């Protein structure tokens, strides 16, 4: 997942509601780096959310890591920062949200004069309206993400199926 | 605040976060309420959740809570705490036994010098002289000192209020 | 040491280090010797070097050598800087004119609270009381409180010690 | 540079000098990520050393970049910051060197649950021994770096000569 370069800074969702943005989300598409991918984001008794991502491996088991999302600034609270078991902190930064369906997530770490990126459009349904993709795409291409690098990923119901 | 940058002491070898759980009472603390104690527990997601208490001088229970991550998880002793409202601050558990005693430390470098907490706990609101006087020997291998330490009030009248 | 997380300023914009570069002085600074001066120079890597003096209550000068450094060239005013012996701090060029004054800033966190440095200088041993106000004011902005500003002692006898 | 885990964090040099370690290095083995690769350290007048990297690039022009080098804890001596112009601040470690004749140097940085690699044979001359390139090779492999994946740098004296 690596482009010359620094990670640029896009904009992030303003007056971000974590509240709203709980529950359950599917990836729909996503920068190179399992299908039928969800994540679903709870309550957490201290600060911050627990975070639960599930997956489908090739041979149809169920991978599943669990985490917690912090924003360090609270000035900033779509600016986070996920610890996964057995993973250094990766920043997590919520670019564009409606928290009823479409969420754009992105990633970047540097790399000296190159980074590495992660982005991620998801949705509250393992589909998404093509025009609303193509907004999101809109979006990632203000900052410098090639749209022909996106997967797209597999939520077909039937091939899914093993997620419940 | 002293001059100098922080110190890197040992922490505790093989720290079993399982077993760190549950209440712990404050005994000695470096100066920064009275009745301390802090609840660690199951979190859903990585790491403790934390919850302090402590009575304040007019008699009502501030209470805060946290999060505790350690980032590398090949040192699972040093922690990263996350309250409400706060900075993170490192917190290194330099030395425990699970069921008596932990002895835990924080600092922070601020250009020549450096801010330091440092704190003495237990699973009981007290803990024998013996093994406050190991602890402060720790202590003062990396340059606390030990005249610079605060006694916590444990007192059960005056903390009847913690219940 | 103040409540309160800290504060993130605006910054000085299109920041041109080369015209920043010289000998400054201290006119008034929060509290952390006197006649104190900086001088900035070209730095064969990048960044530039730093050389502060100040005399000594005794009458000696200390001095300290240093780098700055800007770590994400998008915000060239946004230092970390480097001293002898020291960590790290962060260093902002708040607002600058490169020919009379400048004001600086840096702020480290410490959970609940911070601790913050802020300095306006000049490019002469004294600076004109209106541009004072006016940057007075832009320190009001974010917190700082006016009456804990020291002023720094710049009288030509006192400082005749540093040529 | 991309392989899975976290970061390793081999041994450094103990008593790592820096004033011994100035002057002309030339690379001759590194992971992948110009030829005739040389780094110059010098004199700092403020804290660490400054840099200057130069290579040969395929269409015969010399490209370099100047940097500052900095140990921020002075403790750790071999452990050092790289901030090169308009890039993000590196790692780099001194693992091992005998300052006469080779070094072997390291970095990595995190990102995730994966982490991206540099590693570096550099030498006083524009070879180096294969008995003292075994060795090296041997620490290594002792934290993961695969031998196989070593590009090994054209230091060819003819085709290097654009270097004066």
Redesign the interface.
Known sequence: ??KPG??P?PAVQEDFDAARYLGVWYDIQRLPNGECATATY?L????????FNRERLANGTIKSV?????A????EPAKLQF????????PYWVLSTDYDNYALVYSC?????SH?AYASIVSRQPTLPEETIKKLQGTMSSFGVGVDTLLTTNQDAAYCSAMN
Chains 1, 4 share one sequence.
């Open positions: 997942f690596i620094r990670c800074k709870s957490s008794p201290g600060v911050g959310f627990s975070v669990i985490g917690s999302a912090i360090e600034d609270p000035c610890f996964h078991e057995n993973a250094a902190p990766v770490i540097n790399l000296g004069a590495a």
